[PDB]
C-alpha cells in the first residue's frame, strides 16, 4: 500500500495541476488510495493516522 499512499500524494498535486472542475474530483480520487493502507496501518495495529501522514510526505 505504499504505492497507494505514494501516488495518493502525487495525483492530488497533479489533479491540482489539471485545474478544471475535475481537479477537486481527481484530488478526491487521488486521496482515496490513502485509506487502504490506513485500514492496513489500522488493522496491523497502532496508528494509521500517523502512518500515511509521513509516508505520503
Amino acid at each position: 500500500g505504499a504505492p497507494e499512499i505514494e501516488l495518493a500524494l502525487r495525483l492530488t498535486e497533479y489533479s491540482r495541476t489539471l485545474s478544471g472542475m475535475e481537479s477537486y474530483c481527481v484530488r478526491a480520487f487521488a486521496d482515496a488510495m490513502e485509506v487502504i493502507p490506513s485500514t492496513l496501518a489500522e488493522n496491523a495495529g497502532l496508528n494509521p493516522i500517523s502512518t500515511v501522514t509521513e509516508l505520503r510526505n
Binding site: 489500522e42 488493522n43 496491523a44 495495529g45 497502532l46
Partner: protein, 59 residues
C-alpha cells in the same frame, strides 16, 4: 462439564474445545485454559477499547 454442558455461543465453543484440546494432551491446565482466555480477554478487554489495537499487545 463443558462437554456435558452444551455450548450456546461460538465463544465458549472453542473453550470446551481448547479445554479438551488441552485435556486431550494432558488432563491439567484444562478447566483453567477456559478462564485464562477470558482472563486475558478481560486483560485486553478495555485495552482493545482503550487506544489499543490488541495486535500490538497480543503479539
Amino acid at each position: 462439564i463443558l462437554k456435558l454442558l452444551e455450548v450456546e455461543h461460538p465463544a465458549a465453543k472453542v473453550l470446551c474445545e481448547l479445554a479438551d484440546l488441552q485435556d486431550k494432551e494432558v488432563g491439567d491446565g484444562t478447566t483453567s485454559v477456559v478462564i485464562i482466555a477470558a482472563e486475558l480477554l478481560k486483560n485486553a478487554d478495555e485495552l482493545v477499547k482503550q487506544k489499543i489495537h490488541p495486535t500490538s499487545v497480543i503479539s
